[PDB]
Each structure stands twice: as structure tokens, then as C-alpha cells.
Amino acid sequence: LTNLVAEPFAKLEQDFGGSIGVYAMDTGSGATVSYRAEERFPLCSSFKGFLAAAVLARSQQQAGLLDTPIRYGKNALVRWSPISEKYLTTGMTVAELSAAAVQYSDNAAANLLLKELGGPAGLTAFMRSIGDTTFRLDRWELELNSAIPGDARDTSSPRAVTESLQKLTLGSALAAPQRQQFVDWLKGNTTGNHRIRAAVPADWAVGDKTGTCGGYGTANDYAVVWPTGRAPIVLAVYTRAPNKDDKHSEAVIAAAARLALEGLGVNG
């Protein structure tokens, strides 16, 4: 049930000037669309969704984790911390930091939550615990964005991203309340309007998490989409390009998402 209908992903990535990786699953039938789906691509900020899921998983065993206030100093504020910079003088709760990391890609929040989990290895351990053997986080913000060609640090594959996203949003990897909280944070994302969401009709529910590295044409988005009247779709679109100065393209991500939905026969 993989690639029952071929789609012109090769022409799309050639026009883009790099590589595009796509994995999309129809959770009703199990049909999939797959293009470069087992290649590694940099996660960039997309690890922050899984970070929030790992915090939610811990909160199942640590009541009151989500409500814990976290104070931090000016030295925690790295570039692109649009929410945590407004609460520097007051602190924020773990839940607020998680929402900021997911919904605004807030970097200070992400690093503070990584510390709570035991660093990049602790997030990697969580992914191992749900059966993901591909994901690896190795560094912190902002160093993890280097996006060096051939470097496996801070990468996963579109397939593993989609499989893990399915487990966490629709499967049993989180308990039901935490699962719905994770879905709600993804639905509230503000950074993805020009990526997968641009391919999704306005009357369908969707949650997503973006990533943008800042070099090597490297950017991404993953999402769970609920078309009305049928089972949800889970998908991941990752890009990279050979030259450091190559620019990423949101339009290419949206276009690849459209092709994935067409390949699955989902009228959009």
C-alpha cells in the first residue's frame, strides 16, 4: 500500500535545488506515500514537539510537574525566544514553557525543558522508549542547527518522525489526557501557516511543528491532519540542500504536502 499512485516529488526537489523527504500515512487503511523517507535530515526546531511530548510523559508519573514554576536568568535567553523573554522577570511554568517551545519554537524554553529531561540524551532516551531507533538529539539550541551535509547529529528520518508522531498523538504512547494536551499544543502552533497547513483545507483540524535551521536549505514540518469524514493522516516533510547559503522554501514544503495528500487519495 506504499506509493500506489506516483507523485512528481523528484521534479519538485530539482526545482528547489536540494532534497525533499516525505512520509505520509493514512491511519485508516495504512496506505502510505514515501519519498526519501529513510534518509536523515536535520531536525532543527522540530525536535521541540517531541520534547513537549517527553515532558507530558514524565508528567504522568510526576504530578505537578506541569505546574512547576521555572525561573531563569538573562543568560538563558538565546535568539528566537519570543515568549520566554516576556517572562524573564517572573518565570514561567513547565506547561507554559512547553507550549512556547511547540507553538512559538521558543529556544530558551526548549533548552530549559531539555535540562529538565537530562539533556539531548534524555530526549533521545524517550524516543527510544516509544520504539524510535532513528531519532537522535546530540546538541542544544542553537548549536543543533548547523545542518552540516552528512552529519547525523540532531537528525531523524521523515518515516521515523511520522511513526513517532502517530504513536504520540493517536496511539498509546501517552495516556489519554496527555495525548490530547499534546494534540492541543500542536493545533495551537503559530509558526506553520505557510507549510503543511497551507495544503490543508480550512475546515479540517490540524496540528504541526516546524523546523528551520538557517543554512543548507534545511527546513521541515510534521503534522497530524483530521480530514472530515475519514481517519486522520500523519505526515512529515523535511528538506535540505547542498550549499550552506542555499535558502529554504516554505512553498516547497506546502507543495510536497499537497502531493502527499494527493498520493493518498485524500480530496483536499
CSV table of C-alpha atoms in Angstrom, one decimal:
chain,number,residue,atom,x,y,z
A,1,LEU,CA,0.0,0.0,0.0
A,2,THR,CA,3.0,2.2,-0.4
A,3,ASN,CA,3.1,4.7,-3.3
A,4,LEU,CA,0.1,3.2,-5.1
A,5,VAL,CA,0.0,6.5,-7.1
A,6,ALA,CA,3.3,8.1,-8.1
A,7,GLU,CA,3.7,11.8,-7.5
A,8,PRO,CA,6.3,14.2,-9.0
A,9,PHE,CA,8.5,14.7,-5.9
A,10,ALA,CA,11.7,14.5,-8.0
A,11,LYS,CA,10.7,17.4,-10.2
A,12,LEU,CA,9.8,19.4,-7.0
A,13,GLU,CA,13.1,18.8,-5.3
A,14,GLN,CA,15.0,19.5,-8.5
A,15,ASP,CA,13.2,22.9,-8.9
A,16,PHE,CA,14.0,23.5,-5.2
A,17,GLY,CA,17.7,22.6,-5.8
A,18,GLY,CA,18.0,20.1,-3.0
A,19,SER,CA,16.4,17.0,-1.4
A,20,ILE,CA,12.9,16.6,-0.1
A,21,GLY,CA,11.9,13.7,2.2
A,22,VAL,CA,8.3,12.8,2.7
A,23,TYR,CA,6.4,10.1,4.7
A,24,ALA,CA,2.6,10.3,5.0
A,25,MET,CA,0.3,7.6,6.5
A,26,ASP,CA,-3.4,7.2,6.2
A,27,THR,CA,-4.2,5.8,9.6
A,28,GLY,CA,-7.4,4.3,8.4
A,29,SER,CA,-6.2,1.9,5.7
A,30,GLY,CA,-2.4,2.0,6.4
A,31,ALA,CA,-1.7,3.4,2.9
A,32,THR,CA,1.5,5.4,2.7
A,33,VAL,CA,3.3,7.9,0.5
A,34,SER,CA,7.1,7.7,0.8
A,35,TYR,CA,9.9,9.6,-0.9
A,36,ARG,CA,13.4,9.6,0.5
A,37,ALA,CA,11.6,8.6,3.7
A,38,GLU,CA,14.5,6.7,5.4
A,39,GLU,CA,17.2,9.4,4.7
A,40,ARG,CA,18.3,11.5,7.6
A,41,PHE,CA,17.5,15.2,7.7
A,42,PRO,CA,18.3,17.8,10.4
A,43,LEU,CA,15.5,18.2,13.0
A,44,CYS,CA,16.1,21.9,13.6
A,45,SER,CA,13.3,23.1,15.8
A,46,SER,CA,11.1,20.1,15.0
A,47,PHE,CA,12.6,18.3,18.0
A,48,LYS,CA,10.6,20.7,20.3
A,49,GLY,CA,7.4,18.8,19.6
A,50,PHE,CA,8.8,15.6,20.8
A,51,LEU,CA,10.4,17.4,23.7
A,52,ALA,CA,6.9,18.6,24.8
A,53,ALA,CA,5.7,15.0,24.5
A,54,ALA,CA,8.5,13.8,26.6
A,55,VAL,CA,7.6,16.3,29.3
A,56,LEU,CA,4.0,15.2,29.2
A,57,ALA,CA,5.1,11.6,29.5
A,58,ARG,CA,7.1,12.4,32.6
A,59,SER,CA,4.1,14.3,34.0
A,60,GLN,CA,2.2,11.1,34.1
A,61,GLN,CA,4.5,9.9,36.9
A,62,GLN,CA,5.3,13.3,38.4
A,63,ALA,CA,2.1,15.0,39.3
A,64,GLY,CA,2.6,18.7,39.5
A,65,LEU,CA,5.4,18.8,37.0
A,66,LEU,CA,3.5,20.8,34.5
A,67,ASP,CA,2.6,23.5,37.2
A,68,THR,CA,6.2,23.8,38.5
A,69,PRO,CA,7.4,27.4,38.2
A,70,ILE,CA,10.8,27.8,36.4
A,71,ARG,CA,12.9,30.9,37.0
A,72,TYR,CA,15.7,31.7,34.6
A,73,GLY,CA,18.3,34.3,34.0
A,74,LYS,CA,19.1,36.6,31.1
A,75,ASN,CA,21.8,34.1,30.1
A,76,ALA,CA,19.2,31.6,29.3
A,77,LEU,CA,17.7,33.8,26.5
A,78,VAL,CA,19.1,32.8,23.2
A,79,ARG,CA,18.0,34.2,19.9
A,80,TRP,CA,14.3,33.4,19.0
A,81,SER,CA,12.9,33.2,22.5
A,82,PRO,CA,9.8,35.4,21.9
A,83,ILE,CA,7.7,34.1,24.8
A,84,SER,CA,10.3,33.4,27.5
A,85,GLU,CA,11.8,36.9,27.0
A,86,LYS,CA,8.5,38.4,28.2
A,87,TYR,CA,8.5,36.4,31.4
A,88,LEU,CA,12.2,36.8,32.3
A,89,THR,CA,11.4,38.8,35.4
A,90,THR,CA,8.6,36.5,36.5
A,91,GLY,CA,9.4,32.9,35.4
A,92,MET,CA,7.1,30.5,33.6
A,93,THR,CA,5.6,27.1,34.4
A,94,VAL,CA,6.8,23.9,32.8
A,95,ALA,CA,3.5,23.8,30.9
A,96,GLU,CA,3.9,27.4,29.6
A,97,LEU,CA,7.5,26.6,28.6
A,98,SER,CA,6.3,23.5,26.7
A,99,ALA,CA,3.6,25.5,24.9
A,100,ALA,CA,6.1,28.2,24.0
A,101,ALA,CA,8.6,25.6,22.6
A,102,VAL,CA,5.8,24.0,20.5
A,103,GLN,CA,3.8,27.0,19.4
A,104,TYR,CA,6.5,29.7,19.0
A,105,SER,CA,9.6,27.5,18.7
A,106,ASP,CA,10.9,29.3,21.7
A,107,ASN,CA,14.6,28.4,22.1
A,108,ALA,CA,15.2,29.4,25.8
A,109,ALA,CA,12.1,27.4,26.7
A,110,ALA,CA,13.4,24.4,24.7
A,111,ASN,CA,16.8,24.5,26.5
A,112,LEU,CA,15.2,24.8,29.9
A,113,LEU,CA,13.0,21.8,29.2
A,114,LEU,CA,15.9,19.8,27.8
A,115,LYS,CA,17.7,20.4,31.1
A,116,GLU,CA,14.7,19.0,32.9
A,117,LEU,CA,14.9,15.8,30.9
A,118,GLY,CA,18.6,15.2,31.3
A,119,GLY,CA,19.7,16.9,28.0
A,120,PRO,CA,19.8,15.7,24.4
A,121,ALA,CA,20.5,12.1,25.6
A,122,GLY,CA,17.4,12.2,27.8
A,123,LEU,CA,15.1,13.2,24.9
A,124,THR,CA,16.8,10.6,22.8
A,125,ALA,CA,16.1,8.0,25.5
A,126,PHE,CA,12.4,9.0,25.5
A,127,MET,CA,12.2,8.4,21.8
A,128,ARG,CA,13.9,5.0,22.2
A,129,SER,CA,11.2,4.2,24.8
A,130,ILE,CA,8.4,4.6,22.3
A,131,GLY,CA,10.3,2.4,19.7
A,132,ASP,CA,12.0,5.1,17.6
A,133,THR,CA,15.5,3.9,16.9
A,134,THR,CA,16.3,6.6,14.3
A,135,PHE,CA,15.9,9.9,16.2
A,136,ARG,CA,19.0,11.4,17.8
A,137,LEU,CA,19.4,14.7,19.5
A,138,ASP,CA,23.0,15.5,20.3
A,139,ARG,CA,23.3,19.2,21.0
A,140,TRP,CA,21.4,22.1,22.5
A,141,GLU,CA,20.0,25.3,21.0
A,142,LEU,CA,21.4,26.9,18.9
A,143,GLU,CA,24.3,24.6,18.1
A,144,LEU,CA,22.0,21.8,16.9
A,145,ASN,CA,21.0,23.9,13.8
A,146,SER,CA,24.4,23.5,12.0
A,147,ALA,CA,22.8,21.2,9.3
A,148,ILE,CA,26.1,20.0,8.0
A,149,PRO,CA,25.8,17.7,5.0
A,150,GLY,CA,26.3,14.1,6.0
A,151,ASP,CA,26.4,14.9,9.8
A,152,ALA,CA,24.0,12.6,11.6
A,153,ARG,CA,23.9,14.6,14.8
A,154,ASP,CA,20.5,16.1,15.6
A,155,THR,CA,18.7,14.3,12.8
A,156,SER,CA,15.9,11.8,12.1
A,157,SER,CA,14.1,10.5,9.1
A,158,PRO,CA,10.7,11.5,7.8
A,159,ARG,CA,9.4,8.0,8.3
A,160,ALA,CA,10.6,7.8,12.0
A,161,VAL,CA,9.2,11.3,12.7
A,162,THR,CA,5.8,10.3,11.3
A,163,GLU,CA,5.7,6.9,13.0
A,164,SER,CA,6.6,8.6,16.4
A,165,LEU,CA,4.1,11.4,15.8
A,166,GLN,CA,1.4,8.8,15.2
A,167,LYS,CA,2.2,6.9,18.4
A,168,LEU,CA,2.1,10.1,20.5
A,169,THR,CA,-0.9,11.8,19.0
A,170,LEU,CA,-3.1,8.9,18.0
A,171,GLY,CA,-1.6,5.8,19.6
A,172,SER,CA,-1.0,4.7,23.1
A,173,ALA,CA,2.5,6.2,23.9
A,174,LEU,CA,0.9,8.9,26.0
A,175,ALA,CA,-2.0,8.5,28.4
A,176,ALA,CA,-5.3,9.9,27.1
A,177,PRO,CA,-5.2,13.3,28.9
A,178,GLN,CA,-1.6,13.9,28.0
A,179,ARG,CA,-2.2,12.8,24.4
A,180,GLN,CA,-5.0,15.4,24.0
A,181,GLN,CA,-2.7,18.1,25.6
A,182,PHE,CA,0.0,17.3,23.0
A,183,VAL,CA,-2.6,17.5,20.2
A,184,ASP,CA,-3.9,20.8,21.6
A,185,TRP,CA,-0.4,22.3,21.7
A,186,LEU,CA,0.3,21.2,18.1
A,187,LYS,CA,-3.1,22.6,17.0
A,188,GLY,CA,-2.2,26.0,18.5
A,189,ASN,CA,1.1,26.3,16.7
A,190,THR,CA,1.7,29.7,15.2
A,191,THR,CA,4.8,29.1,13.0
A,192,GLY,CA,3.4,26.8,10.4
A,193,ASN,CA,0.8,28.7,8.4
A,194,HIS,CA,2.9,28.5,5.1
A,195,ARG,CA,3.9,24.9,5.4
A,196,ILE,CA,1.7,21.7,5.7
A,197,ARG,CA,-1.2,23.9,6.9
A,198,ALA,CA,-1.2,25.7,3.5
A,199,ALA,CA,-2.0,22.4,1.9
A,200,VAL,CA,-4.8,21.5,4.3
A,201,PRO,CA,-8.4,22.8,3.8
A,202,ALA,CA,-9.5,25.4,6.4
A,203,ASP,CA,-12.4,23.1,7.6
A,204,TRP,CA,-10.1,20.3,8.7
A,205,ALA,CA,-8.3,20.2,12.0
A,206,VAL,CA,-4.5,20.2,12.0
A,207,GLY,CA,-1.6,20.4,14.4
A,208,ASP,CA,2.0,20.8,13.4
A,209,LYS,CA,5.5,21.6,14.5
A,210,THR,CA,8.0,23.3,12.2
A,211,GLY,CA,11.8,23.4,12.0
A,212,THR,CA,14.1,25.9,10.3
A,213,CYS,CA,17.9,25.6,10.6
A,214,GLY,CA,19.2,28.7,8.9
A,215,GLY,CA,21.5,27.1,6.4
A,216,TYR,CA,21.8,24.4,3.8
A,217,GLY,CA,18.2,24.9,2.6
A,218,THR,CA,17.1,23.0,5.6
A,219,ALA,CA,13.6,23.3,7.0
A,220,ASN,CA,10.7,20.9,7.8
A,221,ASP,CA,7.2,20.4,9.2
A,222,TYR,CA,5.3,17.5,10.6
A,223,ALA,CA,1.6,17.3,11.2
A,224,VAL,CA,-1.4,15.3,12.2
A,225,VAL,CA,-4.4,16.2,9.9
A,226,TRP,CA,-8.1,15.3,10.5
A,227,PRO,CA,-9.9,15.4,7.2
A,228,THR,CA,-13.6,15.3,7.9
A,229,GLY,CA,-15.4,12.0,7.5
A,230,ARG,CA,-12.3,9.8,7.4
A,231,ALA,CA,-9.3,8.7,9.5
A,232,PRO,CA,-6.5,11.1,10.3
A,233,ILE,CA,-3.4,11.5,8.3
A,234,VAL,CA,0.1,11.8,9.8
A,235,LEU,CA,2.9,13.2,7.7
A,236,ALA,CA,6.4,14.7,7.7
A,237,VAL,CA,8.2,16.8,5.1
A,238,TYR,CA,11.9,17.6,5.5
A,239,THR,CA,14.2,19.4,3.2
A,240,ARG,CA,17.9,20.1,2.8
A,241,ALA,CA,20.3,21.4,0.1
A,242,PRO,CA,23.9,21.0,-0.7
A,243,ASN,CA,25.3,24.6,-0.2
A,244,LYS,CA,25.5,26.5,3.1
A,245,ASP,CA,23.9,29.6,1.6
A,246,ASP,CA,21.0,27.7,-0.1
A,247,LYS,CA,17.7,29.1,1.2
A,248,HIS,CA,14.9,27.0,2.5
A,249,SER,CA,11.4,27.3,0.9
A,250,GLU,CA,8.1,27.1,2.8
A,251,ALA,CA,6.3,26.9,-0.6
A,252,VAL,CA,8.2,23.7,-1.4
A,253,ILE,CA,7.1,22.2,1.9
A,254,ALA,CA,3.4,23.0,1.2
A,255,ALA,CA,3.8,21.7,-2.3
A,256,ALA,CA,5.2,18.4,-1.0
A,257,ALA,CA,2.4,18.1,1.5
A,258,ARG,CA,-0.2,18.6,-1.3
A,259,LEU,CA,1.4,15.8,-3.3
A,260,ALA,CA,1.4,13.6,-0.3
A,261,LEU,CA,-2.3,14.1,0.2
A,262,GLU,CA,-3.0,13.6,-3.5
A,263,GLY,CA,-0.9,10.4,-3.4
A,264,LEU,CA,-3.1,9.1,-0.5
A,265,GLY,CA,-6.3,9.9,-2.4
A,266,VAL,CA,-7.4,12.5,0.2
A,267,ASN,CA,-9.5,15.1,-1.6
A,268,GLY,CA,-8.2,18.4,-0.4
